[PDB]
Design a protein around this nucleic acid. Structure first.
Lengths: 66, 124, 252, 155
RNA sequence: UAGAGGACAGGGCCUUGACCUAUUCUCAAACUCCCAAUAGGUAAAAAGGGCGAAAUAACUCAAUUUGU
RNA sequence: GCAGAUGUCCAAAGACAAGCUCAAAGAGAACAGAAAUCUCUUGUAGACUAAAAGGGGAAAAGCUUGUUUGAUUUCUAUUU
RNA sequence: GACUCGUUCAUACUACAGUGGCCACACCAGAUCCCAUCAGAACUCUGAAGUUAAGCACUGUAAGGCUUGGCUAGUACUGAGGUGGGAGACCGCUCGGGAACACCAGGUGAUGAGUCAU
């Protein structure tokens, strides 16, 4: 038989029953498809920083542990 | 002053309204009148015409001299012989309406209009 | 009918002021000044070449929101103190103006010693993009003359070679840069009809430079350029219209 | 039955009266940085990089910048939850948002106020005031303009 | 929907009109110069901001010291 | 529910660049007329843009010309 | 007085007038050369005899347009309340928001960087 085609009735209170949830808004976002030749260079920057920090820490550890 | 009316352009037109042979002959006679090449009309090819300037235009107008109504309100005129003569004459400084860089319009004081066109024709 | 109707004026939308005046293209302009948004603080310098019917102007411009900033400028009338007193609209004059603009820009930036350019005429250098400005880019154009001048001055201005005189003819380019094409015109006019020669190159003779001095004067000009670069308000309007009506009542 | 990309955008995506034509050359000179707020206003003269109908007039942060485009994070309401959407548009359709300009001006002004307040060790209230009830005012008025009002008759 | 004024066509200086100009009565869900109310979006600081120095990069720039 | 449209078409009607400006009206020119071609003036688009309708477009996105095949291979972040 | 590159994109536009020019723009003189066409008209190239006639600048008009303010008008419309009125169509009241056309008046620009001339 003929059926009710459509209605948005009660949909808003259904939505608000568990509230309108907001996005989590994390601090960091994946850089997978973003600005190549920039984030690759950023990887190089981080590697250089880590290498310098690690070599300095290793020097300190060796000179303090004899 | 540099307000004298010179002949800016003289156009000879031959409107046959059909295909070649006669069109080629019309182009040839236009060549003989003016060694410069003619162009043909629409190809919806029906007519041939040419544009001349300077001393050649003046002497061809003199040859065609052989009515004080067929002057246009924009200061141009023409007649017929078969061939149509039409001369568009203007004062100096018409470049400003034709060049690309600072294209603008001349004032109606600088325009030629029909009274000065007729007076120029009578004087010449 | 009238096409200047009140509704026509109501609905009319005006072009930009510069487009109305015919000065700028506003499509070439934004294609020239648009820089990749990744590149922050990328200047994108523009080598503007304009040619009046008396002398040519070359400048270096950087686009800014409040208006362009001009970092260097050179006019062909500056060639008087460099020894070119006549023919300041020439291909050679445009080359010299471009050379002067490039050299003076580099001097302002303190980079002359690091970017010597070229000698005589046959780290990465500064980059600038040529702005033509409404002129049609035919082969053998003074805009490309000035571009070659700046290139020899030491600026890196990208360019092809089809638009130099001859579609490549380095010898023809050299002679046009040195003004030989004007010397040949002087020679042929003098040899054919001296009267037209002296009525055409009138100021050349008054300057006492001949067809054989043009090349040398341009060479030494290049080298010395290189080595040293009222209103009426409503009250008056009402008074004037009142008095005009009073006068008109009797006069007409 | 008809749900194309630009369905229902007859007026939204039309240029204003006497405001037709491409964007100004100065629009290409505006500076965009990562994480700053931006308004998505569709410019119908530029067809590529055109945002979807929904995002016209929305605001979001930059998460990606390309040579002529920008990626902006926009919250869109989908029934029972808000969800983030990464819309990629050309720089003609994006504009530096002023949603936080008052915040930045307040930041700089409050900074230079707090500096001198701490210098003079004066305790100052820095938060915005949401001004409400006005104090009593002992106002003078000559009786030449205290005019009496009566409701008007019908005509 | 009506007249009012004014230099192409028709007949007998005249008329019929057309046309133009300034008006005039009345309208639009698939008309708009203008444009609400309501409704909607973003922002209102600490895992952050501001201000500097030093490091890193294969990125960017004319710049191994421009910028990011 | 209303007015329609689709199962196509295009080596150019795709790409780039350059130059140009369109519809229409008025005036003028042997044949030549309400219309055939040419000239001038005005011309915010009243044209054109494959098709339905709606947006967009004037040194263009329209017209003409030149050179072309980016109507190519691969992969992301994504919008409806 | 000026020019180049811009910004705003009509207070900047349009029509008709008046005034202005030394380097300044420009009109202008030519076509050997690069280049270009039917046409050196345009484009391009080479010039400097002439001219502010025009472009350009400034101003004017009970100018059109544009723009700002007032006024239309707390009108039209509208959010919330009503066991409000009215047979209904519609119309008040309470707590709030608030136009438009038209008409009237003023105005017709301002400005960034650089440069030339005196």
């Amino acid at each position: 038989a003929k059926s009710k085609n459509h209605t948005n009735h009660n949909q808003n209170r259904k939505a608000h029953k568990n509230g309108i949830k907001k996005p989590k808004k994390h601090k960091f976002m994946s850089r997978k498809g973003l600005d190549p030749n920039f984030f690759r260079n950023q990887k190089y920057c981080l590697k250089g920083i880590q290498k310098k920090k690690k070599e300095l820490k290793l020097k300190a550890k060796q000179e303090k542990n004899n | 002053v540099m307000r004298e009316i010179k002949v800016n352009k003289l156009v000879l037109n031959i409107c046959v309204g059909e295909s070649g042979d006669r069109l080629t002959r019309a182009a040839r006679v236009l060549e003989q009148l003016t060694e410069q090449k003619p162009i043909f009309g629409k190809c919806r090819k029906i007519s041939c015409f040419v544009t001349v300037r300077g001393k050649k235009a003046l002497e061809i107008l003199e040859k065609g001299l052989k009515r004080r109504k067929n002057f246009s309100d924009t200061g141009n005129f023409g007649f017929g012989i078969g061939m149509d003569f039409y001369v568009h004459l203007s004062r100096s400084g018409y470049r400003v309406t034709r060049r690309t860089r600072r294209r603008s319009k001349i004032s109606k004081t600088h325009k030629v209009t029909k009274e000065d066109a007729m007076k120029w024709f009578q004087t010449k | 009918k009238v096409v200047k109707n009140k509704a026509y004026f109501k609905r009319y939308q005006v072009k930009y002021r510069r487009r109305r005046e015919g000065k700028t293209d506003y499509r070439a302009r934004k294609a020239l000044i648009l820089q990749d948004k990744n590149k922050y603080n990328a200047q994108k310098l523009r080598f503007v070449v304009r040619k009046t019917n008396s002398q040519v102007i070359c400048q270096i411009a950087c686009a800014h929101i409040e208006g362009d900033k001009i970092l260097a400028e050179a006019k062909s009338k500056e060639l008087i103190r460099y020894g070119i007193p006549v023919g300041l609209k020439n291909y050679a004059a445009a080359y010299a103006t471009g050379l002067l603009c490039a050299r003076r820009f580099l001097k302002s930036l303190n980079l002359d010693t690091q970017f010597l350019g070229v000698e005589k005429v046959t780290r990465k250098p500064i980059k600038a993009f040529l702005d033509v400005g409404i002129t049609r880019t035919t082969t053998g154009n003074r805009v490309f003359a000035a571009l070659k001048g700046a290139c020899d001055g030491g600026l890196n201005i990208p360019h092809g070679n089809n638009r130099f005189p001859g579609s490549f003819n380095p010898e023809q380019l050299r002679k046009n840069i040195l003004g030989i094409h004007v010397a040949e015109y002087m020679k042929t006019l003098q040899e054919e009809d001296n009267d037209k020669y002296k009525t055409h190159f009138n100021d050349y003779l008054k300057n006492n430079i001949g067809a054989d001095d043009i090349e040398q004067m341009y060479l030494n000009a290049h080298e010395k350029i290189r080595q040293n670069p009222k209103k009426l308000n409503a009250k008056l309007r009402k008074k004037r219209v009142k008095e005009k009506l009073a006068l008109y009542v009797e006069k007409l | 039955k008809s749900r194309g990309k630009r369905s229902g955008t007859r007026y939204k995506f039309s240029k204003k009266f006497r405001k037709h034509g491409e964007c100004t050359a100065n629009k290409y000179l505006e500076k965009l940085n990562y994480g700053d707020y931006v308004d998505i206003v569709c410019d119908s003269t530029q067809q590529k990089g055109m945002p979807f109908n929904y995002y016209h007039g929305k605001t979001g942060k930059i998460f990606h910048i390309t040579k002529r485009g920008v990626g902006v994070l926009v919250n869109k309401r989908v029934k029972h939850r808000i969800e983030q959407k990464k819309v990629c548009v050309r720089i003609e359709h994006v504009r530096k948002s002023r949603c936080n300009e008052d915040f930045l001006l307040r930041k700089i002004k409050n900074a230079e106020l707090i500096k001198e307040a701490k210098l003079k060790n004066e305790h100052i209230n820095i938060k915005r005031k949401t001004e409400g009830p006005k104090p009593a005012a002992m106002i003078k008025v000559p009786p030449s303009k205290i005019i009496t009002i009566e409701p008007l008759p019908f005509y």
